[PDB]
Design a protein around this nucleic acid. Structure first.
Length: 158
DNA sequence: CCGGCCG
DNA sequence: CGGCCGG
């Protein structure tokens, strides 16, 4: 079974002219910061949307952060990095690619890291640091002022 | 294909 | 929304 480090490194978003899609990298970094702060592992869509949307806009180059967050909130399930509760309650669109924003808002499913991954992050902070550093090196190589603080990773990345 | 893009 | 683009 693949390590969390390996699963995170297998996330390879499409590279456009402007750069790779930063959606998955931003949600993963946020989720690592959440585990490190011992926030609950599963968090509602509404809470996650509200936390992550402005980071998506500021650090992820997205125009609409809400519209932005919904893509990795679902797509990370396929990358074996994420769990969405009540998934079978959602309405899918676009040939099964994704849930509608309307059904995400209505059902307000909880989601987050897999239990084994979340438990690893809390128990082995060195493993959290290396996973978050890996994402930062690959996608935020010019490291924006504010990024570590805004993702909750300042103390972690000592 | 399948995850972001864009009529 | 949901079909489209293209890495």
């Amino acid at each position: 079974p693949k390590t969390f480090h390996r699963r995170v490194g297998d996330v390879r978003p499409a590279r456009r002219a402007m750069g790779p899609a930063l959606h998955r990298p931003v949600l993963l970094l946020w989720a690592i910061g959440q585990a490190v702060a011992r926030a609950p592992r599963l968090q509602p869509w509404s809470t996650t949307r509200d936390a992550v949307a402005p980071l998506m806009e500021k650090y992820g180059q997205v125009e609409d952060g809400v519209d932005g967050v919904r893509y990795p909130f679902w797509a990370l399930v396929r990358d074996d990095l994420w769990c969405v509760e009540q998934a079978e309650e959602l309405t899918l669109t676009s040939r099964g690619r994704r849930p509608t924003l309307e059904s995400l808002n209505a059902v307000d499913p909880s989601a987050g890291l897999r239990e084994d991954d979340y438990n690893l992050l809390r128990s082995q902070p060195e493993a959290a640091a290396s996973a978050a550093a890996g994402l930062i090196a690959r996608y935020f190589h010019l490291l924006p002022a504010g990024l570590l603080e805004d993702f909750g990773l300042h103390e972690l990345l000592a």
